[PDB]
Amino acid sequence: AARXXRXXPE
């Protein structure tokens, strides 16, 4: 979540 990605830890 701090960069985007699939959600969750991203």
Contact (CB, 8 A) for 2 and 8: no
> What is the Cα–Cα distance from 3 to 10, expressed in whole angstroms?
6
> What is the Cα–Cα distance from 1 to 7, expressed in whole angstroms?
5
Which string of b and e fits 1-10 if b means at least 16 CB within 10 Å?
A: eeeeeeeeee
PDB experimental method: NMR
> What is the Cα–Cα distance from 6 to 2, expressed in whole angstroms?
11
What is the chain's alpha carbon radius of gyration, rounded to the nearest angstrom?
A: 5
